[PDB]
Amino acid sequence: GPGSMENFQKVEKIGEGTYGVVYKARNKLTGEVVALKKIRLDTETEGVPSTAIREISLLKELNHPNIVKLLDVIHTENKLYLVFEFLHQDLKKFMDASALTGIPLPLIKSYLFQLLQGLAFCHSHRVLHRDLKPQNLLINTEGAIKLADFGLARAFGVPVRTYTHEVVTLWYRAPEILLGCKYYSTAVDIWSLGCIFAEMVTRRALFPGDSEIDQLFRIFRTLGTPDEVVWPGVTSMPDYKPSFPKWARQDFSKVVPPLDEDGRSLLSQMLHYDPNKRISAKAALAHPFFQDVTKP
């Protein structure tokens, strides 16, 4: 409710979406640095966009240290300004620019543990994120990492019903989405986070596919082609095909060689084929991998 654009001073552009453009800005009265996301309306013909309605309604309820905080909403008849807490970097940029010899394990562990806290909190408030990827994970100077960009998120019911198909950026997209399953759930965000865990260790995408089928194939070549034993129902999925090549599952220590036993264990449970067996964010928080965790 509280703000107006008079009190902010734009500092520089920091990003862009299909959502519009993001600026860094300064509250001139309190000193607070913020991210302003502009969503123009006079350009749209169908009124306020559903992405924006979802982002605002969902983020107004999710107050958590590992979710980027929506501070305010300036709703003119010409423009919609979303005021967010500002974070200087994203995980992708950090990986490319500073992590050239690696991200040290203490920091991987800290980040992963924070990401799981943030995601657990989403799932406990019946929100699927549905676009977790490094570009959407922001990092501050103090060592916090936070979930951002809730434009693709959705409030779910229990049990879930059918939602939008083909969600999640392709590299981060779960096998159940790829195989066209009628229902998907909280397990799709864990899959993404698993891909992200692996990527923080190697600094390259675990499964960089260039189409749905290529993405499936890359996953199958890494984790083995799933059958009824590892995944009951799989062969009955709408886009499963009997013609699928049958690749052997390789030793998981070959998937991410530098990862320790606890790391491998947790990663395997995040990338389980069966969504029903994949670990939940809430349970992953107690994995031994985190036993010695800090926040540097």
């Binding site: 009124g47 107004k60 799932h123 019911g157 229990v158 879930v160």
Partner: protein
């Protein structure tokens, strides 16, 4: 399995119970509305049921829209000529929130038989967002029902459909249903449906989950029971028509029980 979020369902249930209190309309709003009445609201809701049918919207969308309408009418006086504009805007917002493929704005303008312009629908959309402060993720009767359904032993589609129907019926009549929380109307609906179809009662497992007993549900059950008994006579009939469809197992055709036995 994970489609029932075993690790989160309790957290979620507790959260919805908190939110339903926040998202609750003012019980007495209608007497503070000079130019509209419960009867006019019932006409509007029945029409939204028909719109939902014509566009094959989710039932959840229907419930969100009513929530938005009732919360709006709790702080904004509206002339009878404008009531439909509020309803139209609410259905649009509910559709953009809940639907995979919401109808276009032009389709909403079309269903109001050109009573309003596109500009008017869009301005009202904006006014509704301002009044609700974008607080659109409201708990519905449906959100509670689907969870209560998981407690059936075993699952029964006639029970699920009949409970959905009874819950929809309650949307129509602000008196008395404005006085009841979604979670309680859902409980009453589930118990009445279960009793009607199978003879059984509200399960102890749901006493555990909800803290509600037949004693705490009793007032709503008696209202909902009268509502079910009178439903063939009600001025509004769009829900009964809708639930004659095989998609809902033709549950509107089931005979209501004459007594509930306490």
């Amino acid at each position: 399995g994970v489609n029932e979020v075993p690790d989160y369902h309790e957290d979620i249930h507790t959260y919805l119970r908190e939110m339903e209190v926040k998202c609750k309309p003012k019980v007495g709003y209608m007497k503070k509305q000079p130019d509209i009445t419960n009867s006019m609201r019932a006409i509007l809701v029945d029409w939204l049921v028909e719109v939902g049918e014509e566009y094959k919207l989710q039932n959840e969308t229907l419930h969100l829209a009513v929530n938005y309408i009732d919360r709006f009418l709790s702080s904004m006086s509206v002339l009878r000529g404008k009531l439909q504009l509020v309803g139209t805007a609410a259905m649009l917002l509910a559709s953009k929130f809940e639907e995979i493929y919401p109808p276009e704005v032009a389709e909403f303008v079309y269903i109001t038989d050109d009573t309003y312009t596109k500009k008017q629908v869009l301005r009202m959309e904006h006014l509704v967002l301002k009044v609700l402060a974008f607080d659109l993720a409201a708990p519905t009767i449906n959100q509670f029902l689907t969870q209560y359904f998981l407690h059936q032993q075993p699952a029964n589609c006639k029970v699920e459909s009949l409970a959905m129907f009874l819950g929809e019926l309650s949307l129509i009549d602000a008196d008395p249903y404005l006085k009841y929380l979604p979670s309680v109307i859902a409980a009453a609906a589930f118990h009445l449906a279960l009793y009607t179809v199978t003879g059984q009662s509200w399960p102890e497992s749901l006493v555990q989950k909800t803290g509600y007993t037949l004693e705490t549900l009793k007032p709503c059950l008696l209202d909902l029971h009268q509502t079910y008994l009178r439903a063939p006579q009600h001025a509004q009939q769009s829900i009964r028509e809708k639930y004659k469809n095989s998609k809902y197992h033709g549950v509107s055709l089931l005979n209501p029980p004459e007594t509930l036995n306490v």
